[PDB]
Write a protein that binds this ligand. Structure first.
Ligand SMILES: CN(C[C@H]1O[C@@H](n2ccc(=O)[nH]c2=O)C[C@@H]1O)C(c1ccccc1)c1ccccc1
Ligand SMILES: CN(C[C@H]1O[C@@H](n2ccc(=O)[nH]c2=O)C[C@@H]1O)C(c1ccccc1)c1ccccc1
Ligand SMILES: CN(C[C@H]1O[C@@H](n2ccc(=O)[nH]c2=O)C[C@@H]1O)C(c1ccccc1)c1ccccc1
Lengths: 149, 137, 148
């Protein structure tokens, strides 16, 4: 599966230019942030993305945009943070910012830091993922494309 | 993927008659979830999923396939969490679909008929269609 | 999908000798106390590689494939929850399979040998078969090769 990723700021672009055949692509926490105790926080990941796969014939009564998945990384387990919706389902048509809904199960504030990696993108196929950085997902303004400001 | 869905009552039938990689399922009756609890919430439907037959590696045309029960992203706005993370409905399962919901709150939580907290999903992530049937077979 | 499983002890081997579904249940292999309000990396005493028919995939005969670790539905009646929601095991991973279990209770939780709390699942949702092997490959991490 191939991901076209739009970085929503230059700071985020630099992180993905220096990204430090896996079935999961790690996403960065892009800003230092304090998560309140016993709370759910909708953490903005500073990116938009579309996923591309080979077209396949499916029962329903060359390359296509596909739905994809937002998994916790296994290393999330050592923290008190849990993905509220278990596994995120990103539909083929979504053009908004990718967000991780994080439950802080601790009674203390939790500090996430720029460069932390708590979540990853995954294909329904489970195949290796490649990605590229693009300026827009499509022609629409929500896709960051098209004429004008 | 195409689903054949048996609604276990006419009240449920009506909801789905008047109903994307995920097919939203309805909460079918008003219910109180106790604080700090897990409740097996009955969704009032039975279902089988149909896909094209595939060659798969295994050591000893349309087929029924296993499918998945996901939380809806909007569940995050509630204190409810799916206890088993993602439900796996085996190809051979004929019973009612249940959502095992944890109430993470220290107070009771009220779910309402017509609430949409969970969704069915194919292993392929392909769009879903459904029809209502009287029997699964 | 077909799994080649290395059992890390004879005790575990005996469990899997005496074990069609989309999920292959894995055993808890040792009695263990999970502390209240904790996350415990529970060692499952196995290593495993998954095999599927090769498929063409967009990226810019049988092969090693990635697979998934799901909670079993019966975990729901316990206070135990899978910390990382669903586990992702990358193609060819050679480490011991671990279940990171949150004990959400304020009491210690006793897991028992023979308990079944998690299962392996294919990305295709196809039936799983398995065989017991002594190594995954020639590497020490695969439990194979010379020595020592
Ligand atoms: C509105 N999103 C859902 C969208 O996000 C996309 N989406 C879906 C799943 C996911 O894990 N991440 C994500 O960005 C597609 C969905 O259409 C709300 C939201 C809810 C749960 C997780 C993440 C976001 C939301 C709620 C409150 C504040 C901000 C965002
Ligand atoms: C018996 N189901 C498991 C089946 O339900 C099907 N199943 C599986 C996963 C799921 O999320 N939902 C579901 O309906 C296929 C599984 O084979 C018990 C059950 C336990 C936990 C969650 C959901 C159901 C159960 C036990 C006692 C009372 C009611 C339900
Ligand atoms: C190193 N694993 C991650 C790998 O485990 C494999 N892995 C992945 C997901 C999973 O649920 N179980 C598992 O064994 C493939 C992943 O690449 C660490 C780990 C962290 C949390 C849960 C499970 C494992 C780990 C860290 C420290 C001590 C023991 C285990």
């Amino acid at each position: 599966m191939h991901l076209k990723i739009v970085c929503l700021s230059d700071e985020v672009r630099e992180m993905y230019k220096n990204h430090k055949g896996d079935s999961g692509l790690d996403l960065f926490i892009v800003k230092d942030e304090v998560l309140k105790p016993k709370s759910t926080t909708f953490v903005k990941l500073g990116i938009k993305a579309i996923a591309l796969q080979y077209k396949s014939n499916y029962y329903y009564k060359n390359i296509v945009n596909t739905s994809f998945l937002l998994f916790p990384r296994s290393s999330i387990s050592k923290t008190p943070l849990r993905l509220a919706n278990s596994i995120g389902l990103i539909d083929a048509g979504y053009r908004g910012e990718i967000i991780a809904a994080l439950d802080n199960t601790s009674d203390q504030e939790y500090h996430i830091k720029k460069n932390d990696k708590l979540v990853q993108l995954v294909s329904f196929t489970g195949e290796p993922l490649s990605f590229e950085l693009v300026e827009e997902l499509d022609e629409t303004s929500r896709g960051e494309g098209g004429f004008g400001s």
